[PDB]
């Protein structure tokens, strides 16, 4: 059955209802101030890498777009993440958060203590947008309809860290998901995105919460800190 | 951080498995010591299938990047061994038969629909690594072969039938010859290490999901499905 524009939207939002990472138990702990300092440390370290790789995902999408009108819209994501100079952009907050909990700038930029799961989840996402259909690659951005950075609950985070946290894709998917199969592909792309986010959190819980088996390349408490 | 001799480089690569190879993993230790349930072994068999079904994909992507016929001639045998010569010959079939052996349907296993996303992503990052990094790193990511059994592990488990049980160097030299600066040596050691991280991570996910705390992610296989 082809879904109308309203029904497709409703189906899409449902995937977030059921699968978006706010429902993950690591996220719940974070949000309720139930995490230890080392747990928050591991999350920040890992989320920094995710966020730093978003512009690389958007560039791989950008290089696949068929024309200039679509490049004009998509590139704005890259401009926003990177900004205009070092310290601008808003990748910057994620760096300042990591520095907020004691890591050296170099250790955070090196990516050296991130979980391999987070590296592989980003690899998947980057590849997904470069290899799948363009309808799919755009659909994977839809976690953006489930739009906050919890920190104020943790007394080891200083107000200076606090300081850095001071409808295109959906219209595209609606106009272009023209058969039932393309509607299924779009839904699945958002499910894949949800999986990319859920797998990072799984790894974080596993490594640093329970059973707490830190993988050997991954950050252990005390490393890369001031 | 200096250049290593061909000997010191072999020693260093070896020292990577001794510290990072997946037989040290708690899930593997449980599997090996006969501690797992039937469900745990199912989840393992189901996920592992994907890793084994993607080896010849990885070897093909590697084969496409070899610079000449002679190197393709040598690497091609790997694809032969995994894919075989006829409809249930190759390496892959044992994993399909182990899966069917613990009760899965052929279709469901082949579907991959029940594997952990962490399995998919880790195995897929491996294929991409071999396609995208230097040739030297691609070849170095096969050196877990230096530490390579499942046959004997499976024997600790009553429910694995005698039927199921029956179904169960160039790269090092290449690395030694072509890793002629310290950066290349490091790239080679980090490739190995990357291949140990692919394996280690699939096991982390299986542990989390099916042993403890036992939180199965959203579409992953659950007791009773695909059986």
Pull the structure tokens for residue B37.
């349930």
Q: What is the DSSP letter of B4?
A: P
Cα angle A178, A179, A181; round to 5: 130
The residue written with tokens 């992610």 in the block is: B217
Q: Which long-range contacts (CB under 8 A, 24 or more apart) does A80-85 make?
A: A81/A51, A81/A54, A81/A55, A82/A55
A205 is written with which tokens?
Answer: 């819980």
CA distance A8 to A2: 9
Report the distance separating Cα B109 and Cα B154, nearest Å.
19
Radius of gyration in angstroms for the set of CA atoms belonging to chain B, rounded to a whole number: 18
**Minimal Cβ distance to B122: which of A25, A120, A196:** A120
| Domain with A137 in it | 1-226
Distance (Å, rounded) from C-alpha A116 to C-alpha A124?
A: 12
**Method of determination used here:** X-ray
Distance (Å) of CA B179 to CA A177, A225, B59: 49, 33, 21
Q: Quote the minimal CA–CA distance from B207 to chain A in Å.
A: 9
* Residue A225 dihedral angles phi and psi, to the nearest 5°: -100, 160
Nearest to B127 by CA among B79, B202, B172, B62: B62
CA A12 to CA A10: how far, in whole Å? 5
Chain A residues within 8 A of B205 when measuring between CB atoms: 117, 199, 202-203, 206
Residue B115 phi, psi (nearest 5)? -75, 155
- Are the CB atoms for A50 and A211 separated by under 8 Å? no
Q: Which of A203, A35, A24 is nearest to A119 (CA)?
A: A203
The domain that holds A182 is classified in CATH as: 1.20.910.10
CA distance A42 to A50: 13
Please name every residue paired with A225 in a beta bridge, in sequence order, or none if there are none.
A103
Q: How far is CA A80 from the centre of its chain?
A: 15
> At residue A126, what are phi and psi to the nearest 5 degrees?
-50, -50
Resolution (A): 2.0
Distance CA A34, CA B66 (A): 52
Count the domains in chain A.
1
Dihedral angle over CA of A199, A201, A202, A205, nearest 10: 160
Nearest to A42 by CA among A207, A160, A195: A207
Q: By C-alpha distance, which of A120, A138, A121 is closest to A129?
A: A138
3-state DSSP: chain A helix, strand, coil percent, rounded to 5? 70, 0, 30
Contacts of B118 in chain A (CB under 8 A): 117, 120, 199, 202-203
Contacts of A215 in chain B (CB under 8 A): 197, 200-201, 204
Locate B24 and state its tokens.
């040290």
Instruction: Tell me which residue in A191, A206, A216 faces B208 most closely, judged by beta carbons.
Output: A206
Contact B20 A216 (CB under 8 A): yes
Interface of A with B (CB under 8 A): 18-19, 25, 115-117, 119-121, 123-124, 127, 191, 194-196, 198-199, 202-203, 205-207, 210-211, 213, 215-217
């Amino acid at each position: 059955r082809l879904l109308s524009h309203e029904e497709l939207e409703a189906a899409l939002r449902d995937i977030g209802a059921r699968r978006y990472h706010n429902l993950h138990p690591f996220h719940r702990l974070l949000h309720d101030g139930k995490l230890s300092k080392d747990q928050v440390r591991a999350w920040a370290l890992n989320r920094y890498y995710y966020q730093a790789m978003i512009p690389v995902k958007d560039a791989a999408l950008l290089a696949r777009l068929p024309d200039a009108q679509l490049r004009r819209i998509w590139r704005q994501r890259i401009v926003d993440h990177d900004g205009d100079h070092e310290g601008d952009g808003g990748i910057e907050r994620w760096l300042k958060l990591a520095e907020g909990v004691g890591f050296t700038r170099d250790y955070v930029l090196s990516t050296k203590g991130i979980l391999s799961a987070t590296r592989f989840s980003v690899d998947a996402y980057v590849h997904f947008v470069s290899e799948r259909s363009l309808l799919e690659a755009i659909a994977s951005s839809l976690t953006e309809m489930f739009s906050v950075a919890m920190l104020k609950n943790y007394d080891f985070i200083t107000k200076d860290t606090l300081a850095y946290f001071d409808d295109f894709a959906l219209d595209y998917v609606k106009r272009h998901a023209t058969t039932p199969e393309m509607q299924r592909a779009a839904i699945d792309a958002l499910t894949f995105k949800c999986n990319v986010l859920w797998t990072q959190l799984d790894a974080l819980y596993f490594a640093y919460v329970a059973p707490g088996m830190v993988p050997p390349d991954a950050w252990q408490p005390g490393e890369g800190l001031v």
